RNA sequence: AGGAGUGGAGCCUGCGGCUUAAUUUGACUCAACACGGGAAACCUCACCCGGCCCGGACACGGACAGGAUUGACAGAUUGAU
RNA sequence: AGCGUGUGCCUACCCUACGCCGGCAGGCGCGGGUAACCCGUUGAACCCCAUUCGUGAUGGGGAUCGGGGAUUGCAAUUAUUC
């Protein structure tokens, strides 16, 4: 449910997946995306709203949930990020073969 | 010409009964129906239905009060009454005979039609 | 009496008292281990839960 | 939507206490779990925040069976001049 | 959908002209008179009032119907 | 003769209300008057017995082919 | 004290690695420690139809979920147990400590 | 080459057909027919006979604090307090 | 004998040893198990031993149908189940 919620919300910044790591009296969920400057917003507004909605939805104690956002290298080796990029390129208005050739050339230029 | 009865007791005695031994005069399903609990949850309709039975006209045939309840236990309090019970489309008018105590109004009103076949 | 007859029918039991937690469809529910999904949503979301095909 | 005034207000200072709001899409539920001190169903929250979405002050998101709402600055200012607030209280999502 | 059966209507509610001024009676002297009944419950202390019917007096919300 | 009341084929009869085991011609007479009583009170069971169909409430779409020709 | 530490996880390799790390710490701390007792594993089988509709050959899916559980006993006070369990923990392995 | 059989008997279930206010519907050789994970007394329910509420956002024009509007007990009417 | 399952999120509904009552279906007090810990050494059926039956639509087969008694559930008649 967490992965579904973030792949519906963060469709713009190239979402890849979550990584929930358990700690004694602490939970933190690492978010790996492409635009890590845009997931935070201005002075970390959006990440605060995401922590708040996770705390209010999943039934967690207050102050026990802290989200962390990091960028991942080799964007061309991630299937979800390239699929979202091709979706954004088709939705903005472009030739489908042109976008497919561009993303395939980017993937094999990334070293696949 | 014969005198009518139900487990040996008479009609006037059946009117002068209480529910606690009416359980033992009734059958197993009807005793469970009376012994389930206080009739208030779904059965305020049943309560005020017996109030509608208790409401009586002068010395004529009683008026045909009509229901939508097909699972009513026949009681001695409604002997000689007229009721039109719902079968889905219409209201089947029926005389409550003194032989029917221990039954349901859904039995004397047939829901489906008798099937008369033709050609394939 | 609409406030009393809006939801007067009991729903303590039956298949209408259960629902999927993804699409809310009352058909083909998986009540084993408290997944409480339909079979199609379970096949959609089976890999990331931890269920894999080996047998 | 017929709605008591106290429920509208109480929803509004909950929305301005923390700048998020969550609700499950079900109308036959008696009380909101977060507002268990008072008496209001989920239908009031859904229809009120649907009206506030239509007038254009929140986002909207549906993941599985729950709602997700996010305030914008015009929505912030609308709550500030609806709730009669001096310019010194902000929701915690904007401050650190 | 217009069908051959007659169409029902919602209850329109009849509009009274200044009913509160009919409750308090003002004479030429320095006194105030209460025509209809009052409320005795602990929920409504002295605020709401009862109905002036021909055979009962019905409360506004406390349902303290006293029939003569 | 110390035979318990639950060993009887006719317990709590609808007319006289006593436990009495009935024998052959009496059994046929009691069944005949029971069906006559059901037809007289015009219950669903009596109507199905008068028509000559399955009365216990089972599917008659496929089974029961030798009822008529 | 009778201290029991229960480890339950889904992977087997990370579970064996963290169990090796804990028994190595217990061996280098020079105290009496019980061996890694291996409880029988549990499989969670869900069998469902592949097609969403009711058309096609009757093919079925077979899902499994293996669960591995270990328990290792120690003879020490509590602070040693917490300081040895809060070192180099793995994300996919649950640790759970009680005292009888 | 053989084994268990099925098709004949009773019964359960599904489909076609007929009947019905309604007997909801998809699927018709393998590749439709104990299939839709469909073992439905109510919910399921998508079919029929009847009655309640708006859960018709938002924008415009009327409307209105002298009242825009909400709710209901005596008694009849269905079916329902 | 071996695969399993078992006190559930808004969700109320678990598996049962033991003692008493009743032919049985069942009812009441007491305890266990969030499980290699308790049901449970899962005293399963088919088999094995020994009576009764004797080629008879028969003690094969249990369709159809009547009466009574319990449990689930708000409600079982078009018979829920036993």
From TrEMBL, chain D:
Compartment annotation: Cytoplasm; Nucleus, Nucleolus
Cellular component annotations (GO), alphabetically ordered: cytosolic small ribosomal subunit; nucleolus
Subunit structure: Component of the small ribosomal subunit. The methylated form interacts with NPM1.
Function comment: Component of the 40S ribosomal subunit. The ribosome is a large ribonucleoprotein complex responsible for the synthesis of proteins in the cell.
Binding residues for Zn(2+): 64
Transcription listed as a keyword: no
GO MF term set: RNA binding; structural constituent of ribosome
Family designation: Belongs to the eukaryotic ribosomal protein eS10 family.
Residue ranges annotated for the Plectin/eS10 N-terminal domain, each copy included: 3-96
UniProt organism field: Oryctolagus cuniculus
Keywords (A to Z) from UniProt: Cytoplasm, Isopeptide bond, Metal-binding, Methylation, Nucleus, Phosphoprotein, Ribonucleoprotein, Ribosomal protein, Ubl conjugation, Zinc
UniProt name for this protein: Small ribosomal subunit protein eS10
């Amino acid at each position: 449910e967490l992965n579904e919620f973030l792949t519906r919300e963060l469709a713009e910044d190239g979402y890849s997946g979550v990584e929930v790591r358990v700690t004694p009296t602490r939970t933190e969920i690492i978010i790996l995306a492409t635009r890590t400057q845009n997931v935070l917003g201005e002075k970390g507004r959006r990440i605060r709203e995401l922590t708040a909605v996770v705390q209010k939805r999943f039934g967690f104690p207050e102050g026990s949930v802290e989200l962390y956002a990091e960028k991942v290298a080799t964007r061309g080796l991630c299937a979800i990020a390239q699929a979202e990029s091709l979706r954004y390129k088709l939705l903005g208005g472009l030739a489908v073969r042109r976008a497919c050739y561009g993303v395939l050339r980017f993937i094999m230029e990334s070293g696949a | 010409f014969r005198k009518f009865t139900y487990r040996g007791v008479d009609l006037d005695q059946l009117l002068d009964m209480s529910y606690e031994q009416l359980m033992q005069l009734y059958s197993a399903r009807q005793r469970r129906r009376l012994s389930r609990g206080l009739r208030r949850k779904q059965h305020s309709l049943l309560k005020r239905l017996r109030k509608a039975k208790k409401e009586a006209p002068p010395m004529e045939k009683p008026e045909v009060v009509k229901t939508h309840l097909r699972d009513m236990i026949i009681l001695p309090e409604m002997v000689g009454s007229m009721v039109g019970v719902y079968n889905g489309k219409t209201f089947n008018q029926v005389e409550i005979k003194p032989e029917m105590i221990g039954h349901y109004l859904g039995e004397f009103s047939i829901t489906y039609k008798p099937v008369k076949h033709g050609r394939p | 009496g609409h406030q009393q007859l809006y939801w007067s029918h009991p729903r303590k039991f039956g298949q209408g008292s259960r629902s999927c937690r993804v699409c809310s469809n009352r058909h083909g529910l998986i009540r084993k281990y408290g997944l409480n999904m339909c079979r199609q949503c379970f096949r959609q979301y089976a890999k990331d839960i931890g269920f894999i095909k080996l047998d | 939507m017929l709605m008591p005034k106290k429920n509208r207000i109480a929803i509004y200072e909950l929305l301005f206490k923390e700048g998020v709001m969550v609700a499950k899409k079900d109308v036959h539920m008696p009380k909101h779990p977060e507002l268990a001190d008072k008496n209001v169903p989920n239908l009031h929250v859904m229809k009120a925040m649907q009206s506030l979405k239509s007038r254009g002050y929140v986002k909207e998101q549906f993941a599985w069976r729950h709602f997700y709402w996010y305030l914008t600055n015009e929505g912030i200012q609308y709550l500030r001049d609806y709730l009669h607030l001096p310019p010194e209280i902000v929701p915690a999502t904007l401050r650190r | 959908k217009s069908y051959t059966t007659p169409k029902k209507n919602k209850h329109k509610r009849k509009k009274v002209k200044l009913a509160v001024l009919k409750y308090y009676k003002v004479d030429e002297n320095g006194k105030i008179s209460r025509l209809r009944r009052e409320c005795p419950s602990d929920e409504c202390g002295a605020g709401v009032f009862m109905a002036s019917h021909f055979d009962r007096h019905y409360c506004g919300k406390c349902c303290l119907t006293y029939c003569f | 003769y110390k035979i318990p009341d639950w060993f009887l084929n006719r317990q709590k009869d609808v007319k006289d209300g006593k436990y009495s085991q009935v024998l052959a011609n009496g059994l046929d007479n009691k069944l005949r008057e029971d069906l006559e009583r059901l037809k007289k009170i015009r219950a669903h069971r009596g109507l199905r017995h008068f028509w000559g169909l399955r009365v216990r409430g089972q599917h008659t779409k496929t089974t029961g082919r030798r009822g008529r020709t | 004290h009778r201290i029991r530490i229960t480890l339950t996880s889904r992977n087997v390799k990370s579970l064996e690695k963290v169990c090796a790390d804990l028994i190595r710490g217990a061996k280098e701390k020079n105290l009496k420690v019980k061996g890694p007792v291996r409880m029988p594993t549990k499989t969670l089988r869900i069998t469902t139809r592949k097609t969403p509709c009711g058309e096609g050959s009757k093919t079925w899916d077979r899902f499994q979920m293996r669960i591995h559980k270990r328990l290792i006993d120690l003879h020490s006070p509590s602070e040693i147990v917490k300081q040895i369990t809060s070192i180099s923990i793995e994300p996919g392995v649950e640790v759970e400590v009680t005292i009888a």
